Design a protein around this ligand. Sequence first.
Ligand SMILES: CCNCc1cccc2[nH]ccc12
Ligand SMILES: CCNCc1cccc2[nH]ccc12
Ligand SMILES: CCNCc1cccc2[nH]ccc12
Lengths: 179, 245
Amino acid sequence: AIRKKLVIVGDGACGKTCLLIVFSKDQFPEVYVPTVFENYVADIEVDGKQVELALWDTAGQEDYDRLRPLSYPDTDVILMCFSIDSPDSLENIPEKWTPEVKHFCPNVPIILVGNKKDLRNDEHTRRELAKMKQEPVKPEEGRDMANRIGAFGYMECSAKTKDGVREVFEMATRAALQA
Amino acid sequence: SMEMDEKDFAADSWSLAVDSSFLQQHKKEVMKQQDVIYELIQTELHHVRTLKIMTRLFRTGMLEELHLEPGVVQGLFPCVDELSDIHTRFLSQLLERRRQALCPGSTRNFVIHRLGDLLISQFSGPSAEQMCKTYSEFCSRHSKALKLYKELYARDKRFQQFIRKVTRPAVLKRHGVQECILLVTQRITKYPLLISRILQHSHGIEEERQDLTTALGLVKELLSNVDEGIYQLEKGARLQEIYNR
Ligand SMILES: CCNCc1cccc2[nH]ccc12
Ligand SMILES: CCNCc1cccc2[nH]ccc12
Ligand SMILES: CCNCc1cccc2[nH]ccc12
């Protein structure tokens, strides 16, 4: 079991905190959904290789440009998150997050993750976004952004239903293990 | 952590920590407020525990077992005693507020109605000046600590054995040296998230809504001051690199 480090980045509305909680518990909390995530070391076996994957959140560091980069040293894989119910969170990926992650984590694989995929066909989400002349992020829009920023890959998930969550972290482990 | 506190904060939530007959006596909004206050105190208890691992298990173990050069242990654990004194005092105040609120005859049933004033006190005056001074120093020495740890682990055999020995137990899985350093650095930026959610469920008493609003503002002022006072120290950096920053 080799030790690897994962950091999740993205806007507050991207759902990064919920994603880490749901993966670490293998359950969407039924009684109480924690406000914050401290850290976790997940035991993952991917393609026959055992890894201890340390998980870190950057929630709360978004407005502090000198505190936030302290989370980056020795990172092996980055999860760059946006929410499918928020085209505004996707627009902030090439402008702010990508240059920052390429500066502090050179040559570290980035997986672009579209969170809240269960809201793509939610009528309330479609009605709300239509007021600001918007609609949920389309799969090809996510793929194209991932291609443009030089992401290792593009993935979608729903922390609410758990669909795609395990796959995201197993792929992150594979990326962390590459040359 | 001491057994009494671990047991008091063993449950995933306030709603699961209190007796079910006691829970049934409160309105939905009070349960939501109490669950978030419980998360703040529980995470503070864990944060103080992280500082005890750093001071007692790591720092003191290296002093009593290894032959490191002078100034090496201080470089690995900058300001740990000051950080431990700030948070142990704050945790004592939070735990005393919970204890005074317990129902007679109970060691688990309580409701905290007045957290705001405690948070204003912690994030203002001399205690806020000490938190600002301590985190500005600690966070500016983060890179130097990580780099000194890596060199020692890779070149000193006795240091490597010590680390592997004390971090072997499963209860230390999340708490190696670098992981403790990052848990501490990230602690301060968790406060606004927790305070805003407590505020969201504290509109019932206007004086409480006002106090938490003041506390949230003070925590953000502290974070902005710390963020502005950080400049990563680098071992061997020449004066020219510094004055050309
Ligand atoms: C039944 C769990 N398998 C053990 C395992 C899987 C992946 C990573 C691991 N690190 C230590 C044990 C370990
Ligand atoms: C030379 C340009 N890269 C520097 C950089 C890019 C993105 C975010 C950053 N924060 C501090 C420097 C910094
Ligand atoms: C999305 C609103 N949160 C509801 C909730 C349910 C259970 C416990 C809670 N503590 C704070 C909010 C809270």
